[PDB]
JSON list of C-alpha atoms (C1' of nucleotides) and ligand atoms in Angstrom, two decimals:
[
{"chain": "A", "resi": 1, "resn": "UNK", "atom": "CA", "xyz": [-44.26, -36.89, 30.15]},
{"chain": "A", "resi": 2, "resn": "UNK", "atom": "CA", "xyz": [-41.43, -39.52, 29.56]},
{"chain": "A", "resi": 3, "resn": "UNK", "atom": "CA", "xyz": [-38.47, -37.04, 30.55]},
{"chain": "A", "resi": 4, "resn": "UNK", "atom": "CA", "xyz": [-35.71, -38.59, 28.28]},
{"chain": "A", "resi": 5, "resn": "UNK", "atom": "CA", "xyz": [-32.56, -39.83, 29.97]},
{"chain": "A", "resi": 6, "resn": "UNK", "atom": "CA", "xyz": [-30.24, -36.64, 29.27]},
{"chain": "A", "resi": 7, "resn": "UNK", "atom": "CA", "xyz": [-27.22, -38.42, 31.43]},
{"chain": "A", "resi": 8, "resn": "UNK", "atom": "CA", "xyz": [-25.28, -39.76, 28.99]},
{"chain": "A", "resi": 9, "resn": "UNK", "atom": "CA", "xyz": [-23.11, -37.05, 27.35]},
{"chain": "A", "resi": 10, "resn": "UNK", "atom": "CA", "xyz": [-20.40, -35.76, 29.71]},
{"chain": "A", "resi": 11, "resn": "UNK", "atom": "CA", "xyz": [-19.08, -32.05, 29.84]},
{"chain": "A", "resi": 12, "resn": "UNK", "atom": "CA", "xyz": [-15.38, -31.09, 31.43]},
{"chain": "A", "resi": 13, "resn": "UNK", "atom": "CA", "xyz": [-15.50, -27.54, 31.11]},
{"chain": "A", "resi": 14, "resn": "UNK", "atom": "CA", "xyz": [-19.28, -26.91, 31.71]},
{"chain": "A", "resi": 15, "resn": "UNK", "atom": "CA", "xyz": [-19.69, -25.44, 35.31]},
{"chain": "A", "resi": 16, "resn": "UNK", "atom": "CA", "xyz": [-15.93, -23.61, 35.17]},
{"chain": "A", "resi": 17, "resn": "UNK", "atom": "CA", "xyz": [-15.96, -19.98, 35.00]},
{"chain": "A", "resi": 18, "resn": "UNK", "atom": "CA", "xyz": [-15.78, -18.04, 31.73]},
{"chain": "A", "resi": 19, "resn": "UNK", "atom": "CA", "xyz": [-14.43, -15.61, 29.91]},
{"chain": "A", "resi": 20, "resn": "UNK", "atom": "CA", "xyz": [-16.60, -13.90, 27.58]},
{"chain": "A", "resi": 21, "resn": "UNK", "atom": "CA", "xyz": [-15.07, -11.17, 25.10]},
{"chain": "A", "resi": 22, "resn": "UNK", "atom": "CA", "xyz": [-17.59, -8.93, 22.68]},
{"chain": "A", "resi": 23, "resn": "UNK", "atom": "CA", "xyz": [-15.41, -6.96, 19.55]},
{"chain": "A", "resi": 24, "resn": "UNK", "atom": "CA", "xyz": [-16.65, -4.59, 17.20]},
{"chain": "A", "resi": 25, "resn": "UNK", "atom": "CA", "xyz": [-16.91, -5.45, 13.43]},
{"chain": "A", "resi": 26, "resn": "UNK", "atom": "CA", "xyz": [-18.66, -4.49, 10.20]},
{"chain": "A", "resi": 27, "resn": "UNK", "atom": "CA", "xyz": [-19.98, -0.35, 10.61]},
{"chain": "A", "resi": 28, "resn": "UNK", "atom": "CA", "xyz": [-17.63, 1.70, 12.43]},
{"chain": "A", "resi": 29, "resn": "UNK", "atom": "CA", "xyz": [-18.85, 3.47, 15.56]},
{"chain": "A", "resi": 30, "resn": "UNK", "atom": "CA", "xyz": [-22.72, 1.74, 15.38]},
{"chain": "A", "resi": 31, "resn": "UNK", "atom": "CA", "xyz": [-20.88, -1.84, 15.94]},
{"chain": "A", "resi": 32, "resn": "UNK", "atom": "CA", "xyz": [-18.99, -0.16, 18.58]},
{"chain": "A", "resi": 33, "resn": "UNK", "atom": "CA", "xyz": [-21.96, 1.10, 19.82]},
{"chain": "A", "resi": 34, "resn": "UNK", "atom": "CA", "xyz": [-24.04, -2.62, 19.93]},
{"chain": "A", "resi": 35, "resn": "UNK", "atom": "CA", "xyz": [-21.05, -4.30, 21.70]},
{"chain": "A", "resi": 36, "resn": "UNK", "atom": "CA", "xyz": [-22.13, -2.37, 24.69]},
{"chain": "A", "resi": 37, "resn": "UNK", "atom": "CA", "xyz": [-25.64, -3.35, 24.04]},
{"chain": "A", "resi": 38, "resn": "UNK", "atom": "CA", "xyz": [-24.60, -6.41, 23.62]},
{"chain": "A", "resi": 39, "resn": "UNK", "atom": "CA", "xyz": [-22.09, -6.54, 27.13]},
{"chain": "A", "resi": 40, "resn": "UNK", "atom": "CA", "xyz": [-25.62, -5.04, 29.15]},
{"chain": "A", "resi": 41, "resn": "UNK", "atom": "CA", "xyz": [-27.60, -7.58, 27.83]},
{"chain": "A", "resi": 42, "resn": "UNK", "atom": "CA", "xyz": [-25.16, -10.12, 28.89]},
{"chain": "A", "resi": 43, "resn": "UNK", "atom": "CA", "xyz": [-24.64, -8.02, 32.26]},
{"chain": "A", "resi": 44, "resn": "UNK", "atom": "CA", "xyz": [-28.45, -7.66, 32.84]},
{"chain": "A", "resi": 45, "resn": "UNK", "atom": "CA", "xyz": [-28.04, -12.02, 32.16]},
{"chain": "A", "resi": 46, "resn": "UNK", "atom": "CA", "xyz": [-24.94, -12.53, 34.65]},
{"chain": "A", "resi": 47, "resn": "UNK", "atom": "CA", "xyz": [-26.65, -10.21, 37.34]},
{"chain": "A", "resi": 48, "resn": "UNK", "atom": "CA", "xyz": [-29.74, -11.45, 37.04]},
{"chain": "A", "resi": 49, "resn": "UNK", "atom": "CA", "xyz": [-28.69, -15.34, 38.24]},
{"chain": "A", "resi": 50, "resn": "UNK", "atom": "CA", "xyz": [-26.14, -13.92, 40.78]},
{"chain": "A", "resi": 51, "resn": "UNK", "atom": "CA", "xyz": [-23.01, -14.61, 38.76]},
{"chain": "B", "resi": 1, "resn": "C", "atom": "C1'", "xyz": [38.39, -35.73, -47.73]},
{"chain": "B", "resi": 2, "resn": "C", "atom": "C1'", "xyz": [33.59, -34.33, -45.91]},
{"chain": "B", "resi": 3, "resn": "G", "atom": "C1'", "xyz": [30.05, -36.77, -42.51]},
{"chain": "B", "resi": 4, "resn": "A", "atom": "C1'", "xyz": [24.95, -38.11, -38.19]},
{"chain": "B", "resi": 5, "resn": "G", "atom": "C1'", "xyz": [25.95, -37.65, -33.79]},
{"chain": "B", "resi": 6, "resn": "G", "atom": "C1'", "xyz": [28.95, -38.15, -29.26]},
{"chain": "B", "resi": 7, "resn": "G", "atom": "C1'", "xyz": [32.21, -35.71, -25.91]},
{"chain": "B", "resi": 8, "resn": "U", "atom": "C1'", "xyz": [35.09, -31.14, -23.64]},
{"chain": "B", "resi": 9, "resn": "A", "atom": "C1'", "xyz": [35.05, -25.54, -23.20]},
{"chain": "B", "resi": 10, "resn": "G", "atom": "C1'", "xyz": [33.21, -21.29, -23.07]},
{"chain": "B", "resi": 11, "resn": "G", "atom": "C1'", "xyz": [29.29, -17.34, -24.79]},
{"chain": "B", "resi": 12, "resn": "G", "atom": "C1'", "xyz": [23.88, -15.70, -25.89]},
{"chain": "B", "resi": 13, "resn": "C", "atom": "C1'", "xyz": [18.43, -16.01, -25.51]},
{"chain": "B", "resi": 14, "resn": "C", "atom": "C1'", "xyz": [14.12, -18.04, -22.84]},
{"chain": "B", "resi": 15, "resn": "C", "atom": "C1'", "xyz": [10.87, -20.36, -19.15]},
{"chain": "B", "resi": 16, "resn": "G", "atom": "C1'", "xyz": [10.35, -22.32, -14.09]},
{"chain": "B", "resi": 17, "resn": "U", "atom": "C1'", "xyz": [11.50, -21.22, -10.11]},
{"chain": "B", "resi": 18, "resn": "G", "atom": "C1'", "xyz": [13.85, -18.94, -4.96]},
{"chain": "B", "resi": 19, "resn": "A", "atom": "C1'", "xyz": [15.50, -16.95, 1.70]},
{"chain": "B", "resi": 20, "resn": "C", "atom": "C1'", "xyz": [14.20, -12.31, 1.71]},
{"chain": "B", "resi": 21, "resn": "U", "atom": "C1'", "xyz": [12.43, -7.59, -0.72]},
{"chain": "B", "resi": 22, "resn": "G", "atom": "C1'", "xyz": [10.35, -3.35, -3.17]},
{"chain": "B", "resi": 23, "resn": "G", "atom": "C1'", "xyz": [6.09, -1.13, -4.30]},
{"chain": "B", "resi": 24, "resn": "G", "atom": "C1'", "xyz": [1.27, -2.00, -6.18]},
{"chain": "B", "resi": 25, "resn": "G", "atom": "C1'", "xyz": [-4.23, -3.54, -7.52]},
{"chain": "B", "resi": 26, "resn": "C", "atom": "C1'", "xyz": [-9.04, -4.55, -4.29]},
{"chain": "B", "resi": 27, "resn": "G", "atom": "C1'", "xyz": [-11.51, -3.97, 0.97]},
{"chain": "B", "resi": 28, "resn": "A", "atom": "C1'", "xyz": [-19.76, -2.34, 3.36]},
{"chain": "B", "resi": 29, "resn": "A", "atom": "C1'", "xyz": [-15.78, -1.65, 9.55]},
{"chain": "B", "resi": 30, "resn": "G", "atom": "C1'", "xyz": [-9.62, -0.25, 11.93]},
{"chain": "B", "resi": 31, "resn": "U", "atom": "C1'", "xyz": [-5.50, 3.60, 14.08]},
{"chain": "B", "resi": 32, "resn": "C", "atom": "C1'", "xyz": [-3.34, 9.15, 12.96]},
{"chain": "B", "resi": 33, "resn": "G", "atom": "C1'", "xyz": [-4.07, 13.28, 11.04]},
{"chain": "B", "resi": 34, "resn": "U", "atom": "C1'", "xyz": [-7.22, 16.34, 7.32]},
{"chain": "B", "resi": 35, "resn": "A", "atom": "C1'", "xyz": [-3.05, 17.39, 1.55]},
{"chain": "B", "resi": 36, "resn": "A", "atom": "C1'", "xyz": [-6.93, 18.68, -2.34]},
{"chain": "B", "resi": 37, "resn": "C", "atom": "C1'", "xyz": [-11.93, 20.52, -4.24]},
{"chain": "B", "resi": 38, "resn": "A", "atom": "C1'", "xyz": [-15.50, 27.34, -0.77]},
{"chain": "B", "resi": 39, "resn": "A", "atom": "C1'", "xyz": [-9.74, 31.81, -0.96]},
{"chain": "B", "resi": 40, "resn": "G", "atom": "C1'", "xyz": [-11.18, 24.03, 1.49]},
{"chain": "B", "resi": 41, "resn": "G", "atom": "C1'", "xyz": [-9.21, 28.37, 6.55]},
{"chain": "B", "resi": 42, "resn": "U", "atom": "C1'", "xyz": [-1.30, 28.91, 3.95]},
{"chain": "B", "resi": 43, "resn": "A", "atom": "C1'", "xyz": [-5.16, 30.41, -3.91]},
{"chain": "B", "resi": 44, "resn": "G", "atom": "C1'", "xyz": [-3.43, 26.15, -6.49]},
{"chain": "B", "resi": 45, "resn": "C", "atom": "C1'", "xyz": [-1.22, 23.38, -10.20]},
{"chain": "B", "resi": 46, "resn": "U", "atom": "C1'", "xyz": [4.37, 22.48, -11.66]},
{"chain": "B", "resi": 47, "resn": "G", "atom": "C1'", "xyz": [9.81, 20.78, -13.18]},
{"chain": "B", "resi": 48, "resn": "U", "atom": "C1'", "xyz": [13.65, 20.32, -9.14]},
{"chain": "B", "resi": 49, "resn": "A", "atom": "C1'", "xyz": [16.12, 19.87, -4.50]},
{"chain": "B", "resi": 50, "resn": "C", "atom": "C1'", "xyz": [16.54, 19.44, 0.33]},
{"chain": "B", "resi": 51, "resn": "C", "atom": "C1'", "xyz": [13.52, 17.50, 4.56]},
{"chain": "B", "resi": 52, "resn": "G", "atom": "C1'", "xyz": [9.06, 15.16, 7.42]},
{"chain": "B", "resi": 53, "resn": "G", "atom": "C1'", "xyz": [5.28, 9.56, 10.94]},
{"chain": "B", "resi": 54, "resn": "A", "atom": "C1'", "xyz": [1.55, 10.41, 6.53]},
{"chain": "B", "resi": 55, "resn": "A", "atom": "C1'", "xyz": [-1.23, 12.85, 3.93]},
{"chain": "B", "resi": 56, "resn": "G", "atom": "C1'", "xyz": [2.67, 16.52, 2.92]},
{"chain": "B", "resi": 57, "resn": "G", "atom": "C1'", "xyz": [6.27, 21.40, 4.01]},
{"chain": "B", "resi": 58, "resn": "U", "atom": "C1'", "xyz": [9.90, 24.21, 2.17]},
{"chain": "B", "resi": 59, "resn": "G", "atom": "C1'", "xyz": [13.30, 26.87, -1.22]},
{"chain": "B", "resi": 60, "resn": "C", "atom": "C1'", "xyz": [14.35, 28.17, -6.69]},
{"chain": "B", "resi": 61, "resn": "G", "atom": "C1'", "xyz": [11.74, 29.62, -11.12]},
{"chain": "B", "resi": 62, "resn": "G", "atom": "C1'", "xyz": [7.24, 28.79, -13.97]},
{"chain": "B", "resi": 63, "resn": "C", "atom": "C1'", "xyz": [1.47, 28.74, -15.35]},
{"chain": "B", "resi": 64, "resn": "U", "atom": "C1'", "xyz": [-3.53, 30.08, -14.34]},
{"chain": "B", "resi": 65, "resn": "G", "atom": "C1'", "xyz": [-6.56, 25.71, -15.44]},
{"chain": "B", "resi": 66, "resn": "G", "atom": "C1'", "xyz": [-6.17, 31.78, -8.90]},
{"chain": "B", "resi": 67, "resn": "A", "atom": "C1'", "xyz": [-11.36, 33.49, -5.05]},
{"chain": "B", "resi": 68, "resn": "U", "atom": "C1'", "xyz": [-11.24, 39.07, -3.43]},
{"chain": "C", "resi": 101, "resn": "MG", "atom": "MG1", "xyz": [37.29, -35.77, -40.30]},
{"chain": "C", "resi": 102, "resn": "MG", "atom": "MG1", "xyz": [31.05, -31.91, -37.59]},
{"chain": "C", "resi": 103, "resn": "MG", "atom": "MG1", "xyz": [29.14, -31.25, -34.03]},
{"chain": "C", "resi": 104, "resn": "MG", "atom": "MG1", "xyz": [5.67, -9.40, -0.98]},
{"chain": "C", "resi": 105, "resn": "MG", "atom": "MG1", "xyz": [-1.73, 22.44, 0.44]},
{"chain": "C", "resi": 106, "resn": "MG", "atom": "MG1", "xyz": [-7.96, 21.14, 3.92]},
{"chain": "C", "resi": 107, "resn": "MG", "atom": "MG1", "xyz": [-4.59, 25.19, 0.89]},
{"chain": "C", "resi": 108, "resn": "MG", "atom": "MG1", "xyz": [8.01, 22.89, -5.02]},
{"chain": "C", "resi": 109, "resn": "MG", "atom": "MG1", "xyz": [12.28, 10.20, 6.46]},
{"chain": "C", "resi": 110, "resn": "MG", "atom": "MG1", "xyz": [7.98, 10.38, 14.56]},
{"chain": "C", "resi": 111, "resn": "MG", "atom": "MG1", "xyz": [10.72, 21.81, 6.10]},
{"chain": "C", "resi": 112, "resn": "MG", "atom": "MG1", "xyz": [7.03, 29.60, -6.41]},
{"chain": "C", "resi": 113, "resn": "MG", "atom": "MG1", "xyz": [7.87, 29.86, -19.24]}
]
RNA sequence: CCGAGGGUAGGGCCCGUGACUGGGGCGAAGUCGUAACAAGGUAGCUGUACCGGAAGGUGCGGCUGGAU
């Protein structure tokens, strides 16, 4: 497998720490309920990589 | 003399436009309370007046399109 050289495009803020905010939308307290469901999911993902 | 029209001045109407402002219509979700529909938890509605974040409240009279 000839690994295609992916070392051509550079990136400034690619390794920097990131702010993440989740906001509820359409559907009243149901979307608010899901914004926690998205946040735990990103919490499981952050701790799974020692973040 | 009249006279197209030009000029000066002052009015009337209509249209476009204007910092800003007043409310109105619409919204798969927001905040605050819950005024009305049951006696809707203070029966409701009403003209008027005063008042209150807001639905609204209270006064004076009126109607029943008011339960028991
Ligand atoms: Mg003459
Ligand atoms: Mg003339
Ligand atoms: Mg003339
Ligand atoms: Mg406006
Ligand atoms: Mg009332
Ligand atoms: Mg009520
Ligand atoms: Mg009532
Ligand atoms: Mg009154
Ligand atoms: Mg006031
Ligand atoms: Mg106040
Ligand atoms: Mg009062
Ligand atoms: Mg009365
Ligand atoms: Mg009468």
